[PDB]
Swiss-Prot record:
This is Heme oxygenase 1. The record marks D130 as: Important for catalytic activity. The gene is Hmox1. The keyword Oxidoreductase applies. The transmembrane domain is necessary for its oligomerization. Belongs to the heme oxygenase family.
């Protein structure tokens, strides 16, 4: 069984749970405020910072290297424009760093430092999602929050070096299938992908509590 297929199978059920999180329902219903959006976006800032720092540490390692697409995928410079937009010039000393965000960053550093062969799980989970449901979330954000088509505030959702997200995703899946793959690596990669989804679910449960409690 191809890694891309194995991953899709392993994560299809938790994906259902992820897209039907309370925070995400509210999001999809058009019920998303400036405050909430700022929270989530700050949290993603720390997360992709960690992910991308670990991608860079392992860019020449053959267990990840074929998935190394900084120009097309990396989100950090984008998230920097977005933080400046949402939090202002001094956003670096403004933005929150929640405990669930930290738990996520911490795992990212463990994977990147000790188990680089799983790093694919974490890039899969985030980047492919961004190129799928992220695109739908983007249109909802624009309508709900009156964000202009020029794109300010939504750099995270914008992939100017990818012309066709669908064909790119196909390319990425195919590449995933060229990684050296043993049963031990395949099993563990698909477990880590599930953990990645859970980390995301936990982040959203925490953001939603913060918006109420
Ligand atoms: C309202 C929220 C969401 C919607 C509407 C949504 C929608 C989608 C749709 C329609 C696809 C299929 C596209 C294709 O086959 O190429 C997809 C794939 C994916 N999504 Fe989501 N999604 C949402 C949230 C999430 C979250 C929170 C994550 C991860 C944290 C995520 C990760 C992925 C991944 C990794 C894939 C690729 C599956 C694969 O083709 O192997 N999605 N999503």
């Amino acid at each position: 069984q191809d890694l891309s297929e194995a991953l899709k199978e392993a994560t299809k059920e938790v994906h259902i749970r992820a897209e039907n999180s309370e925070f995400m329902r509210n999001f999809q219903k058009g019920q998303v405020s400036r405050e909430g959006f700022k929270l989530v976006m700050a949290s993603l800032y720390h997360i992709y910072t960690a992910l991308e720092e670990e991608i860079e540490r392992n860019k020449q390692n053959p267990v990840y290297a074929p998935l190394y697409f900084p120009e097309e995928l990396h989100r950090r410079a984008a998230l920097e424009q977005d933080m400046a937009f949402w939090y202002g010039p001094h956003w670096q000393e403004a933005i929150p760093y929640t405990p669930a965000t930290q738990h996520y960053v911490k795992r990212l550093h463990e994977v990147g430092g000790t188990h680089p062969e799983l790093l694919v799980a974490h890039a899969y989970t985030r980047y492919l999602g961004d190129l799928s449901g992220g695109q739908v979330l983007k249109k909802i954000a624009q309508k709900a929050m009156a964000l202009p088509s020029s794109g300010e505030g939504l750099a995270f959702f914008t992939f100017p070096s990818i012309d066709n997200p669908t064909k790119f995703k196909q390319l990425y899946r195919a590449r995933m299938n060229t990684l050296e793959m043993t049963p031990e690596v395949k099993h563990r990669v698909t477990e880590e992908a599930k953990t990645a989804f859970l980390l995301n679910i936990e982040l959203f449960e925490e953001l939603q509590a913060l918006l109420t409690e």
